[PDB]
Symmetry: D3
């Protein structure tokens, strides 16, 4: 990585590249039954070849054009999962954050730390005013993230998700620049 | 229009076209300092050359409809289905109408047709409407129709300099 | 469809959609023959991802309309306004329909609507219909509507290894 | 011009470049309307728009292989355009059009350039049919197809809008088994 | 072809066309790699007809470079290109290769010369450069016959089947004309 | 910037963004009657709109597409120049480096320091074999950069540069990944 984001001496964020195709792909299979509650939706497989030629390239192109960041999470130099800034709406000065992490790395404080830099990035660099995270109401290591950083529940989206044939509610949390 | 959507008499819905440009801009200037609370917000050339055509390509590519409203054959506003998300089987609906035509019950009837389309044609499960918190006129729409208030986005809107909260309403395909 | 053209209680003309891909291909195969005599060109895939997407985009950009014909609700064929030439204020109209439905006077009634569009909305001065010099059922159409024969295109067609001539018919605004 | 079409010691045909802009805008205005009849079209556009849009678009079209929009060069310089359009591959046919300045009339330029274009059409493209149409009252173009061996096919009623009005178009086709 | 560059009575240069795709693929397969040294180093008719040839054409339409075929007695014996065009710096490079079957007939030299006049007279560049693997006699000789001067070496400029070789560079200045 | 390259405590490298256009354009008008010896010619120089709408966006896509870097040099926070890796030839495993700096920032070793990070990346990530740098023959300050890091002079380009009306020679320099 020429351009990189050091979160701490253990956590690193960087934009994927095509050569990241294999690990991501494999890294999404090793956890292929679960990873849908964390608003992504890999109930039906990654491909590696698809990631190499289309998804990652599209992701970079998007970073190039400035609508968001689809990035990889790194712990001791290995892809553990991904973090993301999306639904960027400059006029309204806001974006949302998503993320997910391989089970093995659950519990080391990765996502929470990665979100913090990403939050700092969002408020100081993009001069955004609001950042939101959402998570399936249902159970959450994921809701736990906005709650240690200090977001506020603001609402629910009834049937906001459609994972594995099932309808779930989505709960919204938001954090304002002045509160941060 | 070859292709059109009759809501009832007086009220027809249709994609815009380059030639709608001079009037769309006129209609937007006479209302400039309002559409924003209505979640929208101009050089009538830009619409002809860039914005109307983009809205059209976007409809051709199937993600959303940005359409014009017509009262008795004239453009009096817009209605719109955006944030289409086929994976979560949900979308959202926005709208705005020129003062001139307020109170004749257009938006409501227009949304009713749009929701129908969302629900039996795109087979969406969820439809939301979103309104700045202080604008009773828009909120009145989800409310007569039967949506349920779902939450707020703190600081959701940035209208001419200030912060305002947005409030969401939703309708499920089964409550319909 | 949000946006249709209702010809008349049986017949609606409407844009095609990717999801028409499966029926559209079943309907061309069961008619792989007969169809180049009505001057028309693969898989439910190529239609789903490439052909219809471009027709729609063409419509969004304003050159012509490649629409489906719908009898009592389902696709029975397609009607077309092509070679739009604005400067010269003219265009052509082609069309085809599945055998299943050849008796219902669909093509003619659709054509009649599209003609109205060409002259009243597109403000065109001229519309032409073209046909294989030997397709009596095609030739009938312009003729019944009142088009004049203008001439022939020598070898204008190449249908399966062989070539056949094309006959032109035209209709001027001040006649319709 | 690296790649070129030598009609004869006198006439050459070749793609235009952006640098040809100045002299195409200029050669056309020298002659405001004498053009919509010649089936171009008026309100003559500038050198910039020819240099940055029209000529590049013509070249890309040639690269993709549908049609030629080429400049006509009479002994060194730009005296007109000839072109191959409505190239219909499934029906194996195209249409040829052209125009030259009032200054180059008489020298058989169009006729000569057409021939090569046609020859290309029939054995390279392997097209079956080549057509030319022209305004009924525009003997100058008409003499061309009649000179080469095309047959009058029909007239399109009101097929042209030169300036303000409408005139009819007369058609001429030339099949392959036939030249 | 409508548009053609006539080098001489036996040699013509022209843009390739999709239909040229089967012949280029074969011409390359039966030569193969002894062309990696030329500066070419595979893929099919299919890839040539639907991607490589079109990009080539499109780049000719855009006025950046020429990728053309060499024709000996109406037939494709190889290619020549004007690449790395740099209009601001008034310079370009020229490359080529022909099939063995057609070696020794003076084709490459002949087309280079034509290509050169054009680089100098019509595009009005000041500089023209050519390069070649340090040990590719056949290729190095063209520039020297024409009167290009060796300008320098690019260390490890080539990569031919896992080995790296040096590139030697020759330039020719307009006034040296 | 989220993703950057910390060269050292004062010098950072980053992809430029549309909002850097005003500063880039001004820096370019400010110099420019050099900037030719430096091998970066606008010729018909900047225009803050053009860099914002076209030039900076394309550079960003190139970075996404993975074929080069057009980055900004920041001293203590702000643009003082650009570094660049271009002519990326993955097949021959080689590429070239360019860079320019504003006069007021001359002589602090920004370029050298930044080229080393760039090289590192070139040799240990794109895994290139060769890296070159070229410069105007009489551009002592530029020439100094390669020679200080230990490249070797490889040859000359006769009239390779064309500055303000006239021609000058380009001299080439190259570093082979096995000399590191
Ligand atoms: Cl965590
Ligand atoms: Cl209302
Ligand atoms: Cl019928
Ligand atoms: Cl003549
Ligand atoms: Cl030789
Ligand atoms: Cl330095």
């Amino acid at each position: 990585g020429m351009f990189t984001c050091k979160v701490n001496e253990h956590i690193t964020i960087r934009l994927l590249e095509p050569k990241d195709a294999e690990r991501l792909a494999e890294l999404i299979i090793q956890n292929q039954q679960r990873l849908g509650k964390w608003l992504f939706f890999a109930e039906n497989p990654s491909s590696a070849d698809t990631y190499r030629e289309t998804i990652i390239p599209d992701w970079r192109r998007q970073y190039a054009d400035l609508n968001g960041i689809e990035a990889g999470l790194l712990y001791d130099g290995s892809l553990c999962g991904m973090i993301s800034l999306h639904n960027l709406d400059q006029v309204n000065r806001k974006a949302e954050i998503g993320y997910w992490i391989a089970k093995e790395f659950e519990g080391k404080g990765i996502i929470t730390a990665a979100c913090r830099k990403l939050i700092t990035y969002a408020f100081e660099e993009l001069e955004l005013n609001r950042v939101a995270i959402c998570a399936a109401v249902g159970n959450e290591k994921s809701r736990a993230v906005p709650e240690r950083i200090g977001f506020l529940e603001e609402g629910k989206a009834r049937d906001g998700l459609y994972v594995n044939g099932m309808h779930h509610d989505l709960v919204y949390y938001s954090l304002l620049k002045r509160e941060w």
